[PDB]
Amino acid sequence: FSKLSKYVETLRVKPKQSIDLKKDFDTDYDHKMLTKEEGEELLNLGISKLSEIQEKLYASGTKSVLIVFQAMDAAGKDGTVKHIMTGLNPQGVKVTSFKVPSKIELSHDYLWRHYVALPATGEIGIFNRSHYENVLVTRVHPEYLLSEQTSGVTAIEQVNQKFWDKRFQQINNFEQHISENGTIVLKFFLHVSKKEQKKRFIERIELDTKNWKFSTGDLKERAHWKDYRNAYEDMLANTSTKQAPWFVIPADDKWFTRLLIAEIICTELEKLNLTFPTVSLEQKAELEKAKAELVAE
Template sequence: MADERAERIAEFIGPLRVKPGSKVNLRRDFDPRYRAGMRKRDGIELLRTGVSLLAEYQERLAAQNTYGVLLCLQALDAGGKDGTIRHVMSGVNPQGVRVSSFKVPSTEELDHDYLWRYACRLPGRGEIGIFNRSHYEEVLVVRVHPENLVRQKLPDEAGGPGLWDRRYREINNWERYLTDNGFKVVKIFLNLSKEEQRIRFMKRIDLPERNWKFSAADVRERRRWDDYQHAFSEMLSATSTKWAPWYVVPADRKWFARICAAAVLAHTLMDIDPQYPEVGKQARKDLLAAKRELEHEAPAGAPADPYASRHPTADRAADGNDTPAADGRASGTGRPTKKKRG
């Protein structure tokens, strides 16, 4: 990554990355209120820069059509997943992004292996896929509520001791398989404090327009806070790998969480460094032939090539050389001139 911006971004997100092989204690190792000494008013401009970078690299990703990117977002209720997606992806082409949310599995989904429904929603080449909750629900919610295993109809030998270690291994292998086939996996955990979750729940109750976002089930899940903290710590320890690392993003300040998420995704795209495809010689000839035909259709007094008249270097690049066209046209500033006879 020659781009200096990539180096600055890598330095910024370094403290958020879970080192592969490390033993994570979420309460001890990551502060939900961390903000890297940044102020909110400075963060607004940084977020704009991050969104602009994402738009630039997403276009190149789609044009190259070789790699795909899967962004997995995990958080407790009110962690800010929806807002992060909305703000971070605000500047990208929606045709190249697909967001999938995973709720309680359907009967059809339960008739397959636990990774099947996630595999069905993977992005294609040139696309960014976002999982709002992801396959990690299978080692989080299912672990905190083991009664869900009954609904998965596992054979006797598939349950019991070693189940979670086996699922960690299977998920790591699946993500390695995706990476080896050109699909980068980037994983963000929005780390929310218990008090900030309480505040956000209260806001959802107090504001009528937010009531729809609140469910009594949210409070029931909150009672299992310690169980979830343990499950998250185990998950981060076991599944942050060199090919698919976890980033723990402080989520108590929404503006900072969005900057971090944009930086992590931008870093992934810049690491891929997708390039616009170069056309072959025959395709170049066809382009120039079409260009000449369109130039001859220019109305009297109008530039033959309006874009090149304002950007002369673009016209020379299109012709494949650094000299004006041989037909007498002055860098696209007018119609081709007729040669004098005699």
């Protein structure tokens, strides 16, 4: 983990930095410290450690954790969320996968459904797709804004850079408020290359046990790749803060993606210095006494 820990620091997006995904963030790390087999063992320790942290977090009831995932189709997002959940307790973890908004949801501001779904003290909430969709798919297809009664947009011509700027400000305000009121916010962008996306799409199409699930509408979003990259770059450049950071994770090799994310969550949550509750003398005496009754039956 020694070398890996330094590399992980590079994946965080600093507040003042500017973003060029093609040029400066590699979708696949060439100087991988370790073998895939070593990586799998490390990931296994990470999930176990993350599990212990979750238990301490549930037992204290002082903070909540919100973890966000955004990615292009076939970046491994869903599978990564899956792998994390299998390791955790279901009692203090909730996954919400946001999809196209319902009628009721469209009658409220775009943040309302996310605010409603936030994690309570002691629990971890995972957003497999978040409020950031409102500056991503909605920026590429501004026509969706016409179905939002609260957006204030009657024609696509009305939307300019100032509108996305205002949303970035709204989002930053929402995340700063929850950060100041107990929530730890960690955001991950899984960054997959165009080439690798293509290779995964073809693999899915070819497998008779995956292709029932393949949706050809994913191809439409692939054709808007440059539009999405611009949406992603502008968002990362304005919504990553020290309090609520974005991490860009290379997604071309899945085992390495998962390892990176687990390492980063552990490291960030380790700053809370969580411990298990201790047993006091009064509590110790009650336990001994309870044990004495069981023996005397």
